[PDB]
Amino acid sequence: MAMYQNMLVVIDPNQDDQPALRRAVYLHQRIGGKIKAFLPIYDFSYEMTTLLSPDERTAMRQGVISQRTAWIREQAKYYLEAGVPIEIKVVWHNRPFEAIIQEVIAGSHDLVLKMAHQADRLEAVIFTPTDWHLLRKCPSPVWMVKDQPWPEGGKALVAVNLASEEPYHNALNEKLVKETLQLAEQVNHTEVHLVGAYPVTPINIAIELPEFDPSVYNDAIRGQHLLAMKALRQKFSIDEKVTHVEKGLPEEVIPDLAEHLQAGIVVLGTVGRTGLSAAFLGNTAEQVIDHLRCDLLVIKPDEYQTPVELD
Amino acid sequence: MAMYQNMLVVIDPNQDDQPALRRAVYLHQRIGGKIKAFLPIYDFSYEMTTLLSPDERTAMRQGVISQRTAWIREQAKYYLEAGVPIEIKVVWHNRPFEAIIQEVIAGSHDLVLKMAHQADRLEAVIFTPTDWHLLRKCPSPVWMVKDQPWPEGGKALVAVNLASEEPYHNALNEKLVKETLQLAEQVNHTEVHLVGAYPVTPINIAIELPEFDPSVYNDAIRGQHLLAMKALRQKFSIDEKVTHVEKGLPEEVIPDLAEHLQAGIVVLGTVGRTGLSAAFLGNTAEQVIDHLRCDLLVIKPDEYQTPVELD
């Protein structure tokens, strides 16, 4: 099936330009999906309306909605005029991350896009607490669109966890790869790279195990991870030369490699509290995200159950 | 009572230099408290120990603890030698923010200090998801120590919410002021400033109310907020000239004023989910924090109940 057929764009109320919207329109052009431009304003309406009657407060709340609706429509004017299918929805909500996830579930959206600021090209992208909540808890993929362009020739870098999940099978790695291949093809035939990081105990600690040679162990673990990378890449017909296996935690490995490859986007998987390796996967994702200088795509398992309540 | 008598310093495992520790030692010198240098390492120990036996894994986990203990002690060597009371504790934990709050509650700590990075003096301080969790949920005050020095003459800027809480009284404003005065005195006699922001409905929206003059309304609200600022400042013997009442949401007002005043620290109150104006106070705090170029101190109500579980 065509991917990203029902995109939810989170509008940034603090600036006219909307990178997330502009990205969604490009995706409409490439893959054909529809778009909901959604603005959940955190609810400061009561503080804004001190001394007013309840009827006046209602009127002011409604006027804000109508005006913001008009402002979005202005931003999207030529898109709309051209036939791009963009529905505009503005609400007040006590918790914007909750409103977005509830809108995802209610509207059956299959992608969320939201902008993130980058102040300097040598500095990490800035993520807000709303960004973090979404990334952690949204059931659909979340694409954080940095407010700076992709590098020409930019790569897509997929982080895969190659440690054995015996007796189970890692279905998430396959999803990340499959989904990234499909996306990358549509995005100017972007070249997809895979990276498996392998952490090991510091040499000067492991050297204390009796008769134990930490570099021999490390090479063992490297060998295993290379085997698993080879299995994964061959399942998807991916060349060896675009796969990367490196010693370290993911956060020690991925940022340097992303800078080396000029990644346009880094793709990461995380899982629910009940899933295998959930605490590790969440923390390492956070540590990697904290270093990223490019777009981020987080994808979760098919049957991920968000802990956000429905109404 | 002497304040901050049992400080918990969160150690940053990724660098030798510890701004949070250095800050705690200064506070020991000024106010006399003891210090726990606490390092909760997110638990990647199982991924780090692929193919090892359970006994070997135990040994590696323990070796990490011992080595990190030694590394902290090295960082703190002259402090320790000089008689500064610094207890060192290193643990593995699945969720570092939880481990820190649990340590706060178990050890009866009355302050948490943690470093935050600032990449550029013209750019906001960077806050990690662990920082955010702590700020939201830690029952003790949290002092985020940016990794850059205070400006000479730096001010302490306290954000107070002056909207009437009729029929209740705002006890949190008083706590923030009282606590900031006590702290500021000890920190080189730092000059304390108060800021109340007053949001109002956009003129071009409120102008739609019949017979309604939005600038007359705005002035009304300004007058009220000035009255309330005057009451608060007089309770604490604070001069009018170090109080500031300005139209806008807090996040529209405070960052510019902090830059104008060269604030060394901005002090903010937030409350539990059950408290009055909880959603507004949380969101506006986040929006302000997202813009800060200086240290942050968040304080909560005396009977705040953290939603983090005890064991």
Coordinates of C-alpha atoms in Angstrom, one line a residue:
Chain A
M1 CA 0.0 0.0 0.0
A2 CA 1.0 3.6 -0.7
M3 CA 2.6 4.9 2.5
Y4 CA 1.8 8.1 4.5
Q5 CA -1.6 8.5 2.9
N6 CA -3.0 10.5 5.9
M7 CA -0.5 12.9 7.3
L8 CA -0.9 15.0 10.4
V9 CA 1.1 18.2 10.4
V10 CA 1.6 19.9 13.7
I11 CA 1.5 23.6 13.1
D12 CA 4.0 25.9 14.9
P13 CA 2.0 28.8 16.2
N14 CA 5.1 31.0 16.8
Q15 CA 6.2 31.6 13.2
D16 CA 4.5 32.0 9.8
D17 CA 6.7 29.6 7.9
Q18 CA 5.8 25.9 8.4
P19 CA 8.6 23.4 7.5
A20 CA 6.4 20.5 8.6
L21 CA 3.6 21.6 6.2
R22 CA 6.1 22.3 3.4
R23 CA 7.4 18.7 4.0
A24 CA 3.9 17.2 3.9
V25 CA 3.1 19.0 0.6
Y26 CA 6.3 17.5 -0.9
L27 CA 5.1 14.1 0.4
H28 CA 1.7 14.7 -1.3
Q29 CA 3.5 15.4 -4.5
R30 CA 5.6 12.2 -4.3
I31 CA 3.2 9.7 -2.7
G32 CA -0.3 11.3 -2.9
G33 CA -1.5 11.5 0.7
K34 CA -3.8 13.9 2.3
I35 CA -2.9 16.4 5.0
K36 CA -4.4 17.7 8.3
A37 CA -2.7 20.9 9.4
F38 CA -3.4 20.7 13.2
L39 CA -2.7 23.4 15.8
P40 CA -3.4 22.4 19.4
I41 CA -2.9 25.6 21.4
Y42 CA -2.0 25.0 25.0
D43 CA -4.9 26.2 27.0
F44 CA -4.0 29.6 28.4
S45 CA -7.4 30.9 27.4
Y46 CA -8.6 31.3 31.0
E47 CA -5.6 33.3 32.0
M48 CA -6.0 35.5 28.9
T49 CA -9.6 36.3 29.8
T50 CA -9.4 37.5 33.4
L51 CA -12.6 39.3 34.5
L52 CA -14.6 38.3 31.5
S53 CA -18.0 36.7 31.7
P54 CA -18.3 33.0 30.6
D55 CA -20.1 34.1 27.4
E56 CA -17.3 36.7 26.6
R57 CA -14.6 34.0 27.3
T58 CA -16.4 31.7 24.9
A59 CA -16.4 34.3 22.3
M60 CA -12.6 35.0 22.8
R61 CA -11.7 31.3 22.6
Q62 CA -13.8 31.0 19.4
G63 CA -12.2 34.1 17.9
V64 CA -8.8 32.8 18.5
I65 CA -9.7 29.5 16.7
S66 CA -11.2 31.4 13.7
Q67 CA -8.3 33.8 13.5
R68 CA -5.7 31.0 13.7
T69 CA -7.6 29.0 11.1
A70 CA -7.4 32.0 8.8
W71 CA -3.7 32.5 9.5
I72 CA -2.9 28.8 8.6
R73 CA -5.0 29.1 5.5
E74 CA -3.0 32.2 4.5
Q75 CA 0.3 30.2 5.0
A76 CA -1.2 27.4 2.9
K77 CA -3.0 29.6 0.4
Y78 CA -1.3 28.5 -2.8
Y79 CA -1.2 24.9 -1.8
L80 CA -4.9 25.0 -1.2
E81 CA -5.6 26.9 -4.5
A82 CA -3.6 24.3 -6.3
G83 CA -5.7 21.5 -5.1
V84 CA -3.6 20.1 -2.3
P85 CA -5.9 18.4 0.1
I86 CA -5.2 20.1 3.4
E87 CA -7.8 20.2 6.2
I88 CA -7.2 22.8 8.9
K89 CA -8.1 22.1 12.5
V90 CA -7.3 24.4 15.5
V91 CA -8.1 23.5 19.1
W92 CA -7.3 24.5 22.6
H93 CA -6.1 21.7 24.8
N94 CA -4.4 21.5 28.2
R95 CA -1.8 19.2 26.8
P96 CA -0.8 19.6 23.2
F97 CA 1.1 16.3 23.0
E98 CA -2.1 14.5 24.1
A99 CA -4.3 16.4 21.7
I100 CA -1.9 15.4 18.8
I101 CA -1.9 11.7 19.7
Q102 CA -5.7 11.7 20.3
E103 CA -6.0 13.3 16.8
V104 CA -3.7 10.6 15.4
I105 CA -5.9 7.8 16.8
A106 CA -9.3 9.5 16.0
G107 CA -8.3 10.5 12.4
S108 CA -6.4 7.3 11.6
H109 CA -3.3 9.3 10.6
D110 CA -0.2 7.3 9.5
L111 CA 2.4 9.9 9.9
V112 CA 3.0 12.9 12.1
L113 CA 5.3 15.7 11.0
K114 CA 6.5 18.5 13.3
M115 CA 9.3 21.1 12.9
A116 CA 12.3 21.3 15.2
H117 CA 14.7 24.2 15.3
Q118 CA 18.4 24.1 14.5
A119 CA 20.2 27.3 15.6
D120 CA 23.5 26.4 14.1
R121 CA 24.6 23.9 11.6
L122 CA 27.4 22.6 13.9
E123 CA 24.8 22.2 16.7
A124 CA 22.2 19.5 17.6
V125 CA 18.6 20.0 16.6
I126 CA 16.5 21.4 19.5
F127 CA 13.7 19.1 20.8
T128 CA 10.9 20.5 23.0
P129 CA 9.1 18.5 25.7
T130 CA 6.1 18.2 23.4
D131 CA 8.5 16.7 20.8
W132 CA 9.8 14.3 23.4
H133 CA 6.3 13.2 24.4
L134 CA 5.3 12.6 20.9
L135 CA 8.4 10.7 20.0
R136 CA 8.0 8.5 23.1
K137 CA 4.2 7.9 22.9
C138 CA 2.8 8.6 19.4
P139 CA 1.6 5.3 17.8
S140 CA 2.3 6.5 14.2
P141 CA 5.7 7.3 12.8
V142 CA 6.9 10.8 13.8
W143 CA 9.0 12.7 11.5
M144 CA 10.8 15.7 13.1
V145 CA 11.5 18.1 10.3
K146 CA 14.4 20.3 11.1
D147 CA 14.1 23.9 9.9
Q148 CA 17.1 23.6 7.6
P149 CA 17.3 21.8 4.2
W150 CA 18.7 18.4 3.6
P151 CA 22.2 18.2 2.2
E152 CA 22.3 17.4 -1.5
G153 CA 22.8 13.6 -1.8
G154 CA 21.7 13.3 1.8
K155 CA 21.5 9.7 3.1
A156 CA 19.0 7.9 5.1
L157 CA 20.6 6.2 8.1
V158 CA 18.7 3.4 9.9
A159 CA 19.8 2.3 13.3
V160 CA 19.3 -1.4 13.9
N161 CA 19.8 -3.3 17.2
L162 CA 21.7 -6.5 16.2
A163 CA 22.0 -8.1 19.6
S164 CA 20.3 -11.5 19.6
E165 CA 16.7 -11.4 20.8
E166 CA 16.7 -15.3 21.1
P167 CA 14.2 -17.0 21.7
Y168 CA 12.3 -14.2 19.8
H169 CA 12.9 -12.6 16.5
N170 CA 13.5 -8.9 16.0
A171 CA 10.6 -7.7 13.8
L172 CA 11.3 -4.0 14.5
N173 CA 14.6 -3.9 12.6
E174 CA 12.8 -5.3 9.6
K175 CA 10.1 -2.7 9.8
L176 CA 12.6 0.1 10.1
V177 CA 14.4 -1.1 7.0
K178 CA 11.4 -1.8 5.0
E179 CA 9.8 1.4 5.8
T180 CA 12.9 3.4 5.2
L181 CA 13.5 1.8 1.8
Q182 CA 10.0 2.6 0.7
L183 CA 10.3 6.2 1.8
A184 CA 13.9 6.8 0.5
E185 CA 12.8 5.6 -3.0
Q186 CA 10.2 8.4 -3.1
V187 CA 12.5 11.0 -1.7
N188 CA 14.7 11.5 -4.7
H189 CA 16.0 7.9 -4.6
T190 CA 17.9 8.5 -1.3
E191 CA 20.6 6.1 -0.5
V192 CA 19.8 3.9 2.6
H193 CA 22.5 3.0 5.1
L194 CA 22.3 0.7 8.1
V195 CA 24.2 1.0 11.3
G196 CA 24.4 -1.6 14.1
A197 CA 26.4 -0.4 17.2
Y198 CA 27.8 -3.0 19.6
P199 CA 28.6 -1.9 23.2
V200 CA 31.1 -3.9 25.2
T201 CA 32.5 -3.6 28.7
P202 CA 35.5 -1.2 28.9
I203 CA 38.8 -3.0 28.4
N204 CA 40.3 -1.9 31.7
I205 CA 37.2 -3.4 33.5
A206 CA 36.9 -6.7 31.5
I207 CA 40.7 -7.3 31.8
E208 CA 39.9 -8.3 35.5
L209 CA 38.0 -11.4 34.3
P210 CA 40.4 -14.3 34.8
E211 CA 42.0 -15.6 31.6
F212 CA 40.0 -13.0 29.8
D213 CA 41.2 -11.1 26.8
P214 CA 38.8 -8.2 26.1
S215 CA 39.9 -7.5 22.5
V216 CA 39.3 -11.2 21.6
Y217 CA 35.7 -10.9 23.2
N218 CA 35.2 -7.6 21.4
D219 CA 36.1 -9.2 18.0
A220 CA 33.7 -12.0 18.8
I221 CA 30.9 -9.6 19.3
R222 CA 31.9 -7.6 16.2
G223 CA 31.7 -10.9 14.2
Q224 CA 28.3 -11.7 15.5
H225 CA 27.1 -8.2 14.7
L226 CA 28.5 -8.5 11.2
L227 CA 26.7 -11.8 10.7
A228 CA 23.4 -10.3 11.8
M229 CA 23.9 -7.2 9.6
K230 CA 24.7 -9.5 6.7
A231 CA 21.4 -11.4 7.3
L232 CA 19.4 -8.2 7.5
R233 CA 20.9 -6.6 4.5
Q234 CA 20.5 -9.6 2.3
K235 CA 16.8 -9.9 3.2
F236 CA 16.4 -6.5 1.7
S237 CA 18.9 -6.7 -1.1
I238 CA 21.1 -3.9 0.5
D239 CA 24.8 -3.8 -0.4
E240 CA 27.5 -4.5 2.2
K241 CA 29.1 -1.1 1.5
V242 CA 26.1 0.9 2.9
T243 CA 26.1 -1.1 6.2
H244 CA 28.1 -0.1 9.2
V245 CA 28.9 -2.1 12.3
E246 CA 30.9 -0.2 15.0
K247 CA 31.9 -0.7 18.6
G248 CA 30.1 1.5 21.1
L249 CA 26.6 2.4 22.3
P250 CA 24.5 3.8 19.6
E251 CA 24.9 7.3 20.9
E252 CA 28.7 6.9 20.6
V253 CA 28.5 5.7 17.0
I254 CA 25.6 7.2 15.1
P255 CA 26.2 10.9 15.4
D256 CA 29.7 10.7 14.0
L257 CA 28.5 8.4 11.2
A258 CA 25.5 10.6 10.3
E259 CA 27.9 13.5 10.0
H260 CA 30.3 11.4 7.9
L261 CA 27.6 10.2 5.6
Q262 CA 25.7 13.5 5.5
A263 CA 22.6 11.9 6.6
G264 CA 19.4 13.8 5.7
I265 CA 17.5 11.7 8.2
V266 CA 18.2 9.1 10.9
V267 CA 15.6 6.5 11.5
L268 CA 15.1 4.9 15.0
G269 CA 12.8 2.3 16.5
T270 CA 11.4 2.4 20.0
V271 CA 8.9 0.2 21.8
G272 CA 6.3 0.1 24.5
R273 CA 7.1 -0.4 28.2
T274 CA 6.1 -4.1 27.8
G275 CA 8.4 -4.9 24.8
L276 CA 11.7 -6.6 24.8
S277 CA 14.6 -4.3 25.7
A278 CA 12.2 -1.4 26.0
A279 CA 14.2 0.5 28.7
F280 CA 17.4 0.2 26.8
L281 CA 15.8 1.1 23.4
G282 CA 14.1 4.2 24.9
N283 CA 17.2 5.5 26.6
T284 CA 19.6 4.9 23.8
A285 CA 17.2 6.6 21.4
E286 CA 17.1 9.6 23.7
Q287 CA 20.9 9.7 23.9
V288 CA 21.2 9.5 20.0
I289 CA 18.5 12.2 19.4
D290 CA 20.3 14.5 21.8
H291 CA 23.2 14.6 19.3
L292 CA 21.4 14.6 15.9
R293 CA 22.0 17.3 13.4
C294 CA 19.4 16.1 10.9
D295 CA 15.8 15.0 10.6
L296 CA 14.5 12.2 12.7
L297 CA 12.1 9.5 12.0
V298 CA 10.8 7.3 14.9
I299 CA 8.8 4.3 14.2
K300 CA 7.2 1.9 16.6
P301 CA 6.0 -1.7 16.4
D302 CA 2.7 -2.4 14.5
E303 CA 0.8 -3.3 17.7
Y304 CA 2.4 -0.5 19.9
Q305 CA -0.3 0.6 22.4
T306 CA 0.1 4.3 23.3
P307 CA -0.3 5.0 27.1
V308 CA -2.2 8.2 26.1
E309 CA -6.0 8.0 27.0
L310 CA -8.5 8.2 24.0
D311 CA -10.9 11.0 25.2
Chain B
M1 CA 16.5 26.9 59.1
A2 CA 19.6 26.9 57.0
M3 CA 18.6 26.0 53.4
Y4 CA 19.9 23.3 51.0
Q5 CA 21.5 21.3 53.8
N6 CA 21.4 18.0 51.9
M7 CA 22.2 18.5 48.3
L8 CA 21.9 15.8 45.6
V9 CA 24.3 16.4 42.7
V10 CA 23.6 14.5 39.5
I11 CA 26.9 13.6 37.9
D12 CA 27.3 13.8 34.2
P13 CA 29.1 10.6 33.1
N14 CA 30.1 12.0 29.6
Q15 CA 32.7 14.6 30.8
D16 CA 35.3 14.9 33.6
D17 CA 34.3 18.5 34.7
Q18 CA 31.2 18.6 36.9
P19 CA 29.5 22.1 37.0
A20 CA 26.8 20.7 39.2
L21 CA 29.4 19.5 41.8
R22 CA 31.4 22.7 41.6
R23 CA 28.1 24.6 42.3
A24 CA 27.3 22.3 45.3
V25 CA 30.7 22.9 46.8
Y26 CA 30.2 26.7 46.5
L27 CA 26.9 26.2 48.3
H28 CA 28.7 24.2 51.0
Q29 CA 31.1 27.0 51.5
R30 CA 28.2 29.6 51.7
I31 CA 25.5 27.7 53.6
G32 CA 27.2 24.6 55.0
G33 CA 25.2 21.7 53.5
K34 CA 26.3 18.2 52.7
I35 CA 26.6 16.7 49.2
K36 CA 25.7 13.3 47.6
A37 CA 27.4 13.0 44.2
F38 CA 25.0 10.6 42.5
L39 CA 25.5 8.9 39.1
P40 CA 22.5 6.8 37.9
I41 CA 23.8 5.1 34.7
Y42 CA 21.0 4.1 32.4
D43 CA 21.0 0.3 32.3
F44 CA 22.8 -0.8 29.2
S45 CA 24.7 -3.4 31.1
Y46 CA 22.9 -6.3 29.6
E47 CA 23.6 -5.1 26.0
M48 CA 27.2 -4.5 27.0
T49 CA 27.6 -8.1 28.2
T50 CA 26.3 -10.3 25.3
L51 CA 27.4 -13.9 25.7
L52 CA 28.7 -13.6 29.2
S53 CA 27.5 -15.8 32.1
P54 CA 25.4 -14.2 34.8
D55 CA 28.4 -14.3 37.2
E56 CA 30.6 -12.6 34.7
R57 CA 27.8 -10.0 34.0
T58 CA 27.6 -9.3 37.7
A59 CA 31.3 -8.8 37.9
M60 CA 31.2 -6.4 34.9
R61 CA 28.3 -4.4 36.4
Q62 CA 30.2 -4.2 39.7
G63 CA 33.5 -3.2 38.0
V64 CA 31.7 -0.3 36.2
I65 CA 30.3 0.9 39.6
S66 CA 33.8 0.7 41.2
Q67 CA 35.6 2.4 38.4
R68 CA 33.0 5.2 38.1
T69 CA 33.2 5.6 41.9
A70 CA 36.9 6.1 41.5
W71 CA 36.5 8.5 38.6
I72 CA 34.1 10.8 40.6
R73 CA 36.4 10.6 43.5
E74 CA 39.3 11.8 41.2
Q75 CA 37.1 14.7 40.0
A76 CA 36.3 15.6 43.6
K77 CA 39.8 14.8 45.1
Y78 CA 40.8 18.2 46.4
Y79 CA 37.2 18.8 47.7
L80 CA 37.3 15.6 49.6
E81 CA 40.9 16.2 50.9
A82 CA 39.8 19.6 52.1
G83 CA 37.0 18.1 54.3
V84 CA 34.0 18.8 52.0
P85 CA 31.4 16.2 52.9
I86 CA 30.7 14.5 49.6
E87 CA 29.3 11.0 49.5
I88 CA 29.6 9.2 46.2
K89 CA 27.0 6.8 44.9
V90 CA 26.8 5.1 41.5
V91 CA 24.0 2.8 40.4
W92 CA 22.6 1.3 37.3
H93 CA 19.0 2.0 36.7
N94 CA 16.5 1.6 33.8
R95 CA 15.3 5.1 34.2
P96 CA 17.8 7.7 35.6
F97 CA 15.1 10.4 36.3
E98 CA 13.3 7.8 38.5
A99 CA 16.5 6.8 40.3
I100 CA 17.2 10.5 41.0
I101 CA 13.8 11.2 42.4
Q102 CA 13.8 8.0 44.4
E103 CA 17.2 9.0 45.9
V104 CA 15.8 12.4 46.7
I105 CA 12.9 10.9 48.7
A106 CA 15.1 8.1 50.3
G107 CA 17.9 10.4 51.3
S108 CA 15.7 13.4 52.3
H109 CA 17.5 15.7 49.9
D110 CA 16.5 19.3 49.7
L111 CA 18.1 20.3 46.6
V112 CA 18.9 18.7 43.3
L113 CA 21.7 20.2 41.0
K114 CA 22.3 19.0 37.5
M115 CA 24.3 20.6 34.7
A116 CA 22.9 21.6 31.4
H117 CA 24.9 22.5 28.3
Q118 CA 24.9 25.9 26.6
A119 CA 26.6 25.7 23.1
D120 CA 26.6 29.4 22.4
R121 CA 26.0 32.4 24.6
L122 CA 23.3 33.8 22.2
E123 CA 21.5 30.4 22.3
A124 CA 19.1 28.8 24.8
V125 CA 20.4 26.3 27.3
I126 CA 19.9 22.7 26.1
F127 CA 17.6 20.5 28.3
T128 CA 17.5 16.7 28.0
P129 CA 14.5 14.5 28.6
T130 CA 16.0 13.5 31.9
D131 CA 16.2 17.2 32.8
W132 CA 12.6 17.7 31.8
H133 CA 11.3 14.7 33.9
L134 CA 13.2 16.0 36.9
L135 CA 11.9 19.5 36.4
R136 CA 8.3 18.2 36.1
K137 CA 8.3 15.6 38.9
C138 CA 11.1 16.0 41.4
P139 CA 9.7 17.0 44.8
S140 CA 12.7 19.1 45.9
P141 CA 13.9 22.2 44.2
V142 CA 15.9 21.5 41.0
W143 CA 18.7 23.8 40.1
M144 CA 19.9 23.4 36.5
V145 CA 23.4 24.7 36.4
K146 CA 24.4 25.8 33.0
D147 CA 28.0 25.0 32.0
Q148 CA 28.9 28.7 31.7
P149 CA 29.5 31.2 34.4
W150 CA 27.1 33.7 35.8
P151 CA 27.5 37.3 34.5
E152 CA 29.1 39.6 37.1
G153 CA 26.3 41.3 39.0
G154 CA 23.9 38.6 37.7
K155 CA 20.3 39.0 38.9
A156 CA 17.9 36.5 40.3
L157 CA 14.5 36.8 38.4
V158 CA 11.4 35.3 40.0
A159 CA 8.4 34.6 37.9
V160 CA 5.2 35.1 39.8
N161 CA 1.6 34.5 38.6
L162 CA -0.5 37.4 39.7
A163 CA -3.9 36.4 38.3
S164 CA -6.3 36.2 41.2
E165 CA -6.7 32.7 42.7
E166 CA -9.9 33.7 44.5
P167 CA -11.4 32.1 46.6
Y168 CA -7.9 30.6 47.4
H169 CA -4.6 32.4 48.1
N170 CA -1.5 31.9 46.1
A171 CA 1.0 30.4 48.5
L172 CA 3.5 29.4 45.7
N173 CA 4.4 33.0 44.8
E174 CA 5.3 33.5 48.4
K175 CA 7.4 30.5 48.5
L176 CA 9.3 31.4 45.4
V177 CA 10.0 34.9 46.7
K178 CA 11.0 33.8 50.2
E179 CA 13.2 31.0 48.9
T180 CA 14.9 33.2 46.3
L181 CA 15.6 36.0 48.8
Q182 CA 17.2 33.5 51.2
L183 CA 19.4 32.0 48.4
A184 CA 20.3 35.3 46.7
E185 CA 21.6 36.7 50.0
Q186 CA 24.1 33.8 50.3
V187 CA 25.1 34.0 46.6
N188 CA 27.1 37.2 46.7
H189 CA 24.1 39.3 47.8
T190 CA 22.4 38.8 44.4
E191 CA 19.7 41.4 43.6
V192 CA 16.2 39.8 43.4
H193 CA 13.8 40.9 40.7
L194 CA 10.1 39.9 40.4
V195 CA 8.2 39.6 37.1
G196 CA 4.4 39.1 36.6
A197 CA 3.3 38.6 33.0
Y198 CA -0.3 39.3 32.1
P199 CA -1.7 37.7 28.9
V200 CA -4.7 39.3 27.3
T201 CA -6.8 38.5 24.2
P202 CA -5.3 39.9 20.9
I203 CA -6.8 43.3 20.2
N204 CA -8.0 42.4 16.8
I205 CA -10.0 39.5 18.4
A206 CA -11.3 41.3 21.5
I207 CA -12.3 44.4 19.3
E208 CA -15.3 42.1 18.2
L209 CA -16.9 42.3 21.6
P210 CA -19.7 44.9 21.4
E211 CA -18.9 48.2 23.0
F212 CA -15.5 46.7 23.9
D213 CA -12.2 48.6 24.0
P214 CA -9.4 46.2 24.3
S215 CA -6.8 48.8 25.4
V216 CA -9.1 49.9 28.2
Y217 CA -9.4 46.2 29.3
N218 CA -5.7 45.7 29.0
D219 CA -5.0 48.7 31.2
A220 CA -7.4 47.3 33.7
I221 CA -5.6 44.0 33.8
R222 CA -2.3 45.8 34.0
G223 CA -3.6 47.8 37.0
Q224 CA -4.7 44.7 38.8
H225 CA -1.4 43.0 38.2
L226 CA 0.5 46.1 39.5
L227 CA -1.7 46.0 42.7
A228 CA -0.9 42.4 43.2
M229 CA 2.8 42.9 42.5
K230 CA 2.8 45.7 45.0
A231 CA 1.2 43.5 47.7
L232 CA 3.7 40.8 47.1
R233 CA 6.7 43.0 47.1
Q234 CA 5.7 44.8 50.3
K235 CA 5.2 41.5 52.1
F236 CA 8.9 40.9 51.5
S237 CA 10.2 44.4 51.7
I238 CA 11.2 44.4 48.0
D239 CA 11.6 47.8 46.2
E240 CA 9.2 48.7 43.3
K241 CA 12.1 49.3 41.0
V242 CA 13.1 45.6 40.9
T243 CA 9.5 44.5 40.0
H244 CA 8.3 44.2 36.5
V245 CA 4.7 43.7 35.2
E246 CA 4.4 43.3 31.5
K247 CA 1.7 42.3 28.9
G248 CA 2.1 38.8 27.4
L249 CA 2.3 35.2 28.3
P250 CA 5.3 34.5 30.6
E251 CA 7.3 33.1 27.7
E252 CA 6.7 36.3 25.8
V253 CA 8.0 38.5 28.6
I254 CA 10.6 36.7 30.7
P255 CA 13.3 35.8 28.2
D256 CA 13.7 39.4 27.0
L257 CA 13.7 40.7 30.6
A258 CA 16.2 38.1 31.8
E259 CA 18.5 39.2 28.9
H260 CA 17.9 42.8 29.8
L261 CA 18.7 42.3 33.5
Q262 CA 21.5 39.8 32.9
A263 CA 19.8 37.3 35.1
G264 CA 22.1 34.7 36.5
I265 CA 19.1 32.5 37.4
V266 CA 15.4 32.4 36.7
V267 CA 13.2 31.0 39.4
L268 CA 9.8 29.3 38.4
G269 CA 7.1 27.5 40.3
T270 CA 5.1 24.5 39.0
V271 CA 2.5 22.3 40.7
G272 CA 1.0 18.8 40.7
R273 CA -1.7 17.6 38.3
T274 CA -4.3 18.3 41.1
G275 CA -3.3 21.9 41.9
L276 CA -4.9 25.1 40.8
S277 CA -3.9 26.2 37.3
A278 CA -1.6 23.1 37.0
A279 CA -1.9 22.7 33.2
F280 CA -1.3 26.3 32.5
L281 CA 1.6 26.6 35.0
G282 CA 3.3 23.5 33.5
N283 CA 3.0 24.6 29.9
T284 CA 4.0 28.1 30.5
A285 CA 7.1 27.0 32.5
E286 CA 8.1 24.7 29.6
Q287 CA 7.7 27.5 27.1
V288 CA 9.8 29.9 29.2
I289 CA 12.5 27.2 29.9
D290 CA 12.8 26.7 26.2
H291 CA 14.1 30.2 25.8
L292 CA 16.3 30.5 28.9
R293 CA 20.0 31.5 28.6
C294 CA 20.8 31.2 32.3
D295 CA 20.4 28.9 35.2
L296 CA 17.0 27.6 36.2
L297 CA 15.5 26.9 39.6
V298 CA 12.2 25.2 39.8
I299 CA 10.4 25.0 43.1
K300 CA 7.2 23.2 43.9
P301 CA 4.6 23.5 46.7
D302 CA 5.5 22.1 50.1
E303 CA 3.0 19.2 49.8
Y304 CA 3.7 18.4 46.2
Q305 CA 3.3 14.6 45.7
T306 CA 5.6 13.3 43.0
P307 CA 3.9 10.7 40.6
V308 CA 7.2 8.7 40.7
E309 CA 6.8 5.4 42.6
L310 CA 9.0 4.9 45.8
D311 CA 10.7 1.4 45.1

